[PDB]
Structures are given as C-alpha cells and as structure tokens.
DNA sequence: TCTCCGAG
DNA sequence: TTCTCCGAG
DNA sequence: CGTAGCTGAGGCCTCAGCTACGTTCCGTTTTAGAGTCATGTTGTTTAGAATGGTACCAAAACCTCGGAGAA
DNA sequence: TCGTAGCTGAGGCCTCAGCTACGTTCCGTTTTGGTACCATTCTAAACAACATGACTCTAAAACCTCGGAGA
C-alpha cells in the first residue's frame, strides 16, 4: 500500500523577494521529511492515500506563488522500477521502506 | 501513524534536526523523519544522545528502549503527559470500581488461556489445547483458584516438555522474557497516550512493580511472542531477538480487518479502558 | 540507597567511568559517585550522554528526569527491573483524604494573600495591604466566597490601576506571565521528584491544566515575580525579561536562613507533600 | 492509453571533457523528441511498450557515462493528474495527446 | 507509426531543426516532433516552409495536403521512391495479369456496396440497404452492369432525397468531396510506400487521372465519408470540415484488432498488392 | 500552357505576386509572368516559399519537383484537379518495346567506349585505345559477351596500374565516386522533368537502385569525370572534388555547337526519350 | 442601596 | 605458353 | 537552408558559514470546527509478454571471360 | 557536548544566444543474415479513489462566586 509523491521544481533567483519564498519552500520540504533525489527535485514516501491527501494540504498551505512547481504521485512498486543509467541509487534508510532498520 | 522500528548497536551520536533523527557513526550516517519512526531501540552502551531528541522523540509517540552491557531491554521512557488531558482520564481511572476491574480482567485472562490452546492446536496438541478450554470454562472472577496458572503450567510443558520450567535460566525463557517486554512497553506506551497509569493494575495495585496495568492488558498477546520463540526454540538466544522483530513487520486479524501490531494495540487498549470508565459493554477481543 | 540530587542545566556532556558519573561543561568538569546519587535532573535540551551511563543509573535504580524546551518535566525513566522510592509516593498520593486537602491548600492560600499585603505596605499602600489581611482572616476551607480571587483584583487594580485587567495584552500582562511560568516550572519538576503527579490538584483539578498541584504549591511565591514586575512597570517588557531572571541569582528569608530559590521550593515542596501523606504537620511557610 | 517516459539528470560540469559528453545528450533528446519539463528533467511521450522498449535501447546506446541519470516510466493517465502546483500547464501541442492538432 | 494530424491557418513560417517541425506564427510558436506526425494539412495561403522541411517531411511517410483560397484541398505532395527497392515492386506491378486486376477490382467494389447497404441498414433503410445487396450478388469483372452507379444513385437518393444525385454545388457535396479527397491521399501515400504506380489503376491507366490504383483502393472507405456527413447533413460546411477529421482520430475492427486507420489502410493496401502479385489469395475485407 | 523550365539552386525566397513567381536571392532578384512557366526544378534545400505561390504554381499545372541535400529528385506535388505533360509520358515509356530499348542502350554504351579509347588514346595508350575500339565493334544488343566490362577493366588497369581495384578505398575512388554521382544526379533530374521513372532501365534493372534509367543514360559522360580524376590522381581527395566542379564551368562539343554541360544533358536526355517513344530516330551522340 | 466587571 | 583466376560490367 | 561543435553570459540550485534567537495562563466545563489516521472495497487500470510480423543494409553470393600473372 | 530562522556568496549545475566551419563520394543482380523496426490482444495482478468510523487538539464562550468602583 506505500505510495511516493515527487515534487520537481523551477524557481526564479530573480530578486531579494523570489529567493527568500525560495529558501523557505526548501526549508518546508526539509522539514516535512522530503528526500533530495536531484537538484531542485525531491521525493516523499508516504503511507496511504489520506497520509498522502494530507501532505497534499500543506503544500497548498505553503505554496511559495512563484515559479514552476510540479507534484507527481505513484506507488513504491513503481518507483522501485525506475532505472538508473548511470550513477548509484541512493542507499539512505529515508529512502527505503524497511519496516525494521538497523544502524549497523 | 509512524512505522519504522529503529535499531542501534553501533558507536554512535544520535541528534535531533529539522523533524529529523540525526545519526552520526564514524564513517556512515543518516538522517530519519521521526514521523516515520514507531520504536527506538538502543541496543549498546557505546551511544550518545541529546536532550533535544529525547524531548521530539516524546512528542512524537515513539518508544525509546534501553539495554544492559549484554543487550538486553533493562528500561523504557516514561512520558507523563500523553494527552492534552491527562488529568480528565486520571480521575476515571481512580472511580473505577472493583467489580468492574474483575470482569474486564477475567475477560482478558480468558482471552489469553484461548490463544494459549489455538497455539497448541497449531502444533497438532489436539486435546491439551481442549484441556486448556476446559480450564477456561471452569473460572470465576480474579481466578481465585489459579486456572491462569494450571493453564500455563501445561502450556510450557506441552510445548518444550515435562522438565521444562519457565523459572530457569536458558534460550528459551530468555526469548520469551525479552518477548515479554516488548509486548509490555507497547501497551505501557498506548495507556499513558489514553491517560492513564501503569502501576495501577486490575488484580494488583502498584505492589511490585509500576507496570501492572499494562501487564494486565498484554497477557492476551503473550502466545504472539510463544509461537515465534518455539518456531525458533533450538536457535540461539541473538537469533530469536530478530525473530521476535516480526511482530512489529506482521498483520493479524483483529477486527475483521487485517492491522499492524501496534495499531491494533492502540484500538484494544482504547476500547478496554472505555469499558472501565463504563462508557461501553462488551471488551476488545484478539484471537491469533 | 544514595543521597543527592543532581541537576543539570548547562550545555554539557554526560558520561561514565570507574562508577563516577562524569560531567563535563566547557570549562568546569566534576566526577560524581553513582552510589551517592539518589536523582538526576535534566533541566535543559542541551545535554549529551551515553547509553553506558544510562545502564549504570538503571542499575542503581536512581531516578532520572527529562525535561522540554522550557525546563518541565515531559517524562523520567521506567525501569522493567527495580524502582524508585518515588514509585510508592503515588500510591500516598491517591490516600490524600479530601479534608487534609483542604487544611493545607488553604494554608498555602493564606501565605499569598499574606505576601500579597506585604507587597502592597511595600508600596505606600498601608490600607490596602490591611484590607487583604481582613480577606485572609475570613477564609474558610476551598474559600468557598472566593476570598483568594477578591485580594487578587484589589490587589492588581492597586497596582496597576482600576483600569487594568488580566486578560488585556500589555506589556505587564506578558511580564507576569512570563513569570508566572518561570515559578510553576519550578514547582512542576520538585513535585515529580518527590514522585507526585502534577496532574492531581488540591483544589486546582483543571482537565487541560497538567499542572494542578504545581500551580497550587507555587501560589504563595507569584508576589516576587509581582515585585520585579512592578519596579519594572513602566520598562519594555525585554527589560522585564532579563530582570525576573533575579529570582534564581537572589536569596529570600525563609526558615530563619537567607536561601536561594531552588533550594527553598525543595525543601519547601518535600515537607509540604509530607504533611499530606500526613507523615508530618508544620505546613512550610514562606514570607516575603 | 499511452506511456510517458521521464528522465531527470544531474550532470558533472568541471571539465571540458564533462561538458562535452553533457552537450551531446542532450542533443540526443532533443533529436528524439522529448520535451523539457523542467531544467535538467524531460518527458517523452510514448503510444506503446514496444515504443518505450525501443527507446530504452537508444538511451543505454547512447550512455553519456557521467553524472546521475534517471529514468522512470508512467502513465499518459497517472502523468495527466500530476497537479501543477504554480505555473501554467505545458500546452504546448508537443505535450499534448491529442491526435487532431492546430 | 506517426499519429498526429497538423493544421495550419495562420500566417506563419514553417522550418526544421533537429527532427522537429518548426512553426513560428507572429507571436505563438511550436516545434513538433516529426516521428510524431502523421499528416500535415496547410489551409492556408498566407504560409511560408522550407525545401529542406519537405525532404524530412517526404523522408517520414507524412502526408502533405495543400490548400485553395478558399480553404479547399487542390493537392498533395508525390514522392517517388517510396522504398529502398521500388524497382523491385515496380516490375511486379507490370507483371499483373488483366484476369487478376478484375477479380481483385471488383472484390473490392463488392466491398463498396457491402458498406453501401451496412451504412443505410444503419439510417433504418432496412429495405434499400437489402436492395443494394441484390445488386452486389450479380455483376462481373470490372462491372460492365455499371452497378457501381446503379447501387449509388439508389444510396444518395435514399439518404439525402430523390431529387438530389449529388452533381450539385452545396454544402453537402463539398462536403463528401473534401472527404473523399483524404481518403484517396491516404492510399496514395501508402501505395508508393509499398511501391506501386498510383497512375495505373486496376480499370483505367492513368487516361486522365493519376492517382487512378488509389481510387480503386480506397473505394469501401467512402462510407465512412458518408456517415460523417449524413450525420451533419444539415451543417453548414465548416463545420463538416472539422468532423471529418474524425477518421484519423477513430478505430475501426480490421483483423480482429481494433485499429486506427492509417495503420488500417497500411495492412490493407500491402496484402491487396501482395494478392496481385499473386504472393496470396483472399484479400483484405472491411 | 507555358514553355519555360525554372531551375532554383540559391539560397532564396519564393513568392507569388501580380501573376508572376517572385524569386529573391540575397543580391539577385528575378520576376516571372506563370503563364510562361511550364516546369519548376527545386535543386536545394535552402529554398524558402509560399503556400500561395504553390496554390497559383497548381493553378497553372505547372510540374513542380523536389530535391533532397544532394540535388536528386525525391518527388513532386501532385494535383487532384489537372495534370502536366509529363503525366502521359509514364505510358509512352511503358510502351517501350525491348528492341528498341536494346539499339539505344547499346548506341549509348558504344559512345561510352568510344570516350574511353579517346582518353585513352589522349594519355599516349595508342594501343590500348585501339584495344578497346575492338571491343566495341563486337558489340551485340545488350552486350551479352559483356564487351562492356571488359572495356572497363583494361580501361582503368591501364590508367591507374594493372594494381587498382574500383572496390578498394582510395583517394581516386573516392575522386570518380563523388564525380559519378554529380553526373548521375543531372541525368535522374532531366529525366523527371521529361516525365520519366528513373527506376526502369534499359539494362540496368537493379532491386536497389532507384537510378537505373539515369546511371544507363549517363554513361557516355563518365570519361569527362575519369579525364579531371586522373590530370589530379596524385592530388588529395578535397582537391580533387573542386577540380571537378569545373564540368559545370566548362563548354563542350555536344551538336557543333559549344555548350555547357546541364543544357546539353538537357537536349541530350530529350532526344533520347524522344527515340525510345518513336518520336524520332537518330540518337543523340557525345564525343570527348 | 444599587449595578456591573472579573479576580480566583 | 598454356594455365588460373581476378574482377570490370 | 540546414547540421556539428564551441563559448560565455547569466539564470538556477547548493552548501558551508555567517547572524541573531530561544520559558509569556492556571477560576473549570462545553462546544464547535478543523486536524488526525488505517483500514477494506469498486470497478478500472496496468505491466509484460505474446503474436506475427516490415524496412533497411550491408556482406556474400551468383554472372561472363579477355586479360594479367602463374607455371 | 542543544536547537531555530534567515541571509550571504562561492561555485557547481543548466540553458540559451551567438559565434565557427561545412555541405551531392556506386550502378554487374540477387540472395541471405542481422538489426533494427511496429500495433495489436490477453493475463493476473496492481491500483485510486472513496467509504468507514473513528480519535486529538485548540480556542471562545458558558459557567461559578461576590467585594467593589460606582448610578
Ligand atoms: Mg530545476
Ligand atoms: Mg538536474
């Protein structure tokens, strides 16, 4: 039942205003538990639909109003399918589903 | 709800940052959201942590599990203030009357003496598991004439044989014992969340020890815990602690509907304590 | 067991060796034997400490403390094996008949109407001050007419003018609550020291205040914050800040010794659950 | 009742080398016809697994051998509810699936 | 294969790059990808395009279709080589028997009249549809009877009244002729590919048509034509110019797959020409 | 109708206005009335045109040709309302009879080994010319002895050494390979305009080679390109490449007459035709 | 005396 | 001097 | 008119490293509204393989034999 | 050996506009093997999208006792 959302972003560095919304949008993401895959393009696994309709809300809520922002839903079977043609997938436990995990 | 169960054992600095557990070895390290995260176990006692972390991992409903030089649990954390209310569910849990406390923890203890005997119809003991039911039928509230205990006895005798104890020290009583804990900090932490205290117990007020409670309320759980130790029975003690994991990893049916461990805990414990306050009759009820 | 009560509220490392606790700050540096501690107070969210440490301190069953951001305390350590002798203080707590209740908050109560005048005669308001004293002599158990609330608004509306409410957002207002808080912070971790639940009020009995008995022990003492408040009256309410933090750096008369404040509310707090339990009388008193 | 092919890229800039190896994938892409969708992130339709299949090829083809490249495949139907959260649809017939056009 | 169909009306320039159509208007632009297209359309005469856009354009099968004053389709791009082997195919297409091309032919125009009765079976003609059917049943090879004609009268006059044949300058003409003209290109388009002569068609060499063998081909796809246009009869022509467009975005059951047309007609003209050249029997039936 | 035939080779845009095609090059600029126009040659792709001008091109069934990045024709627009001459010309060449087809193929392939003696004699092999003139006399409709091949081999051993191979990759190769394929290029368009299928050779009837008619056509012009390849068979391949443009410069002796070498191809391809229909007899002849 | 406001 | 076998079409 | 390939301007996107910041109730109970969360259930996607093929391009095969090179 | 928010600037990513150099390299035919193609249908299995029926908080107003600054 897991499911991951992908948020994709453009956003302008133009002025003093456009960066500031910028670092906060950041921030907000950090802080909610979002995964940086690639630059200006991060990943949050999620639970259920109502885990993910939720985290939806808050986006809305911290929605910066500038640029191109983009948010992208599919499931872990999914995602797990992405291929990568060159460089390694990232091993950090965040990333993973493990129910269990162990620091060593 | 938060599913991860987070384990330890490596010479480490845990840290908190931005809604995150911050984990710090010497080469390797991590960064973990504390909504994910159900269960901490610190497994060694080469670990550093903050304050900080200990307040956000109380915030968060995740509990935190302390372990001996031989890594075993010794101790949890007890947080006081589980609710915006606390004290509304203290003052019920006080006006709970004698009878009452009787019926629900028969009805509990009759619950365990079940499971006890569908585990042994698992392991093809077709009339001992009768027996137990017999045992069942025939007790009144409190178990004055300890029918819990002469379950029991041919319950670890049937099991792992006629010279076996539960009192000595082996592999086997080990692995329940650590099983036990665990099962017991599950419903110690979703009772202070419902508001209540642990020492206080149906049977037995803080006597001996300030889990009574929730001791009380896990006793129909315990088979859980029998079923993957006997399935490992002849495996060494590390081997059966990861065994045990699974409970957290696995589903059972318990009200119609396929749940997690600990949310199911949640439900059950919630509805037992509804009855005490006589906001309900009938009890939660969980078959394996 | 042991004897001593250790509090730590400095950014700092924790640590074990040679059955000493080891306490590093930047600067200072002290060992301490587990033996003789008795409780260990986290105060603050800038403190480091290992497992092994934790494990030592289990196994002497000595009580610790864990503290938020604003110094309360959030929760303590539960062991599965051994406990506390603040453990059975609970069981005291709930034996609490409703009449000694009564004798006692009430005596709390006439200490801070007491204070209350004395602060007022402070300010050249002789009358007044005597007007509260009249309040106090009129007080029956529970102040059933409401004698605490009628000295509380002669007394701020002498202050601070008939103009002035509680409720409205002032500069004022924000310094006394401000101190306010400081004080019950106070009082909420010595209660769970003496092994108290801070939930169960004497008269206070609030749903979402998990702090009741807290809020009752400190009533007496809200006058000094009251004091500085006052000769800060006029100040920014950052001035008012740094000028409350006097409470700690000071010493007040109150058994016949110039103490520091910490130190009173103690033994304050210990002797006042004491004669509650009812293992003495001689209510503790304190005079500004 | 297509395909829609995604790739993401984080490319290394230091050297002229790096630079190089950059400049003809990303020609590549253009000359197959993928859209970008954002900086360092382009979308290929597609009407059939057999035409992903192929496309795979290609791509493991020509490998650029550098940075971290990505690739994920979806739906034309999961890809249309993606929600826009600021900015304005692509509307560009190029991102479009409608096989009549203006 | 290519499945889009772009329309140009507006003033503009049309170029390449990089695989792409270019299509720069005064302030809107596009690049398409050209795998992507399938058929270009240019409506107006207000449009500019490269030499080296139609290479590229004639080097994928796209169909470009070209356009009047008025809107109307007066051409169509030929290319010749059509294959690596066009030769190949050519000397086979040369080699076709008269007694082939007849049966052949006329198993299509059969196919005509099939689709004739099945479209006024669907406008409740229960009747003339049976009536057609008749017609179909008895004729030889390469129609002497004229019951090509007999069956067409009958099927216009049924539809759209007695006192229409459909000589006339209205909507509705113009209509089913700017429909049949798509049909035609289609064929046209694909036979080359296949690598035939378009000019010698199964009845009539190229006497005054050149796109005679296409004409033949296309002959049980006007039907579908004929529906659109019914179904909008009383539209003014615009409008049915739109709906029309209806057969490239559609699928229809050729071979127990359901499949869009161009693919269809791909399929259909390679196995007709394959019977031909006598590499199989049966044909192809819609 | 109208008798011009437009060649575009330039960079350039096309335009219609006032009933003429509207030619701009950058420094050039040329009107022509439609009337007049009777074929319209699009060599390159760097030419630029409106949708207009093609409508009004359509209007007049003008033939319109297309050509791919190396001046072959790969089509041509084709009108649904009208036609051009060149359309009945498709059933003309189909009623070519196979004799015929032999006389003026094997006309075509003396005159080639004429020209091949010719420069041969021209490098001082007065043998070796004479040799081939031999072959030539022999000569069968549709050379089935293949006098032809054999003229060739010893053709090309003699020049460039007994050594040389066609296949074998050099810079003379090469040199003849990019000269071949210009000439083929003039013929394969001459013919279109004549309105003819470059697919149907005379002899040539290959799968593969959509030129056959042309590459059968041409082949009396070869020693022209063998003449510059060889005055350059020591030079480096891109020089030879400019030196060859030179066919386009220069002048010939085709009829009497020095002309340039496209207008001669031109008349040359048309009296062919012209023969094979039966429109005439007397082939074209063309003399090194 | 009378009537609010509002401390607890 | 008769022989093979290369490679232009 | 187009490809190929390069440069450099300037807009994106990070990170390490600065700065400044850090305890604001206490008469209790009701009510209303906006946050939680975890499961099962609908008709409907969907991978992924299977099916039956076409389009191109070289390499290697087939041709006739007059002559260069072998013997 | 605690955490936050927020800002700065170096330098790595990523694009675009703007330069440069460049631009027809077979013609004995046919057969055969390899590498591309391409549009369909069919299968269990996966999914999204509610529906279910809950529980957790927080503010604001509702409730209480009456001495008092006042009409
Ligand atoms: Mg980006
Ligand atoms: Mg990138």
């Not at chain 2, 070895?25 to 060694?44: K, N, P």
Request: net charge positive; with cysteine.
């Amino acid at each position: 039942r897991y499911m991951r959302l992908l948020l994709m972003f453009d956003m302008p560095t133009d002025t003093a205003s456009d960066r500031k919304a910028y670092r906060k949008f950041r921030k907000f993401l950090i802080n909610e538990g979002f995964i940086m895959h690639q630059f200006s393009v991060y990943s949050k696994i999620l639970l259920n639909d109502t885990a993910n309709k939720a985290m939806l809300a808050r986006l809305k809520q911290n929605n910066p109003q500038r640029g191109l922002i983009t948010l992208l839903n599919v499931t872990e079977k999914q995602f797990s399918r992405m291929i990568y043609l060159h460089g390694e997938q990232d091993n950090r436990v965040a990333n993973s589903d493990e129910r269990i995990v162990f620091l060593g | 709800m938060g599913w991860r169960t987070v384990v330890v054992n490596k010479h480490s600095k845990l840290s908190y940052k931005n809604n995150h557990l911050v984990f710090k070895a010497i080469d390797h390290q991590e960064l973990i959201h504390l909504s994910e995260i159900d269960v901490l176990l610190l497994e060694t006692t080469d670990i550093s942590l903050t304050t900080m972390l200990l307040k956000r991992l109380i915030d968060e409903k995740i509990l935190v599990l302390f372990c001996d030089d031989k890594r075993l649990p010794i101790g949890k954390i007890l947080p006081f203030y589980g609710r915006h209310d606390s004290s509304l569910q203290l003052t019920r849990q006080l006006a709970w009357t004698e009878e009452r406390k009787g019926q629900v923890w028969t009805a509990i203890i009759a619950q365990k003496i079940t499971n006890q005997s569908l585990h042994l119809a698992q392991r093809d003991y077709g009339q001992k598991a009768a027996a137990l039911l017999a045992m069942r039928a025939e007790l009144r509230l409190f178990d004055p004439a300890n029918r819990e205990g002469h379950a029991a006895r041919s319950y670890f005798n049937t099991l792992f044989g006629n010279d076996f104890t539960r009192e000595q020290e082996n592999d086997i009583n080990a692995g329940l014992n650590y099983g036990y804990t665990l099962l017991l900090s599950i419903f110690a932490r979703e009772l202070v969340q419902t508001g209540c205290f642990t020492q206080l117990g149906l049977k037995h007020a803080n006597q001996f020890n300030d889990f009574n409670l929730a001791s009380d309320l896990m006793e129909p759980f315990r088979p859980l815990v029998d079923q993957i130790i006997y399935e490992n029975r002849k495996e060494a003690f590390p081997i059966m602690k990861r065994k045990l994991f699974a409970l957290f990893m696995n589903t059972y049916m318990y009200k119609k509907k396929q749940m997690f461990l600990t949310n199911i805990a949640t439900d059950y414990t919630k509805h037992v304590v509804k009855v005490l306050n006589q906001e309900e009759e009938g009890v939660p009820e969980f078959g394996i």
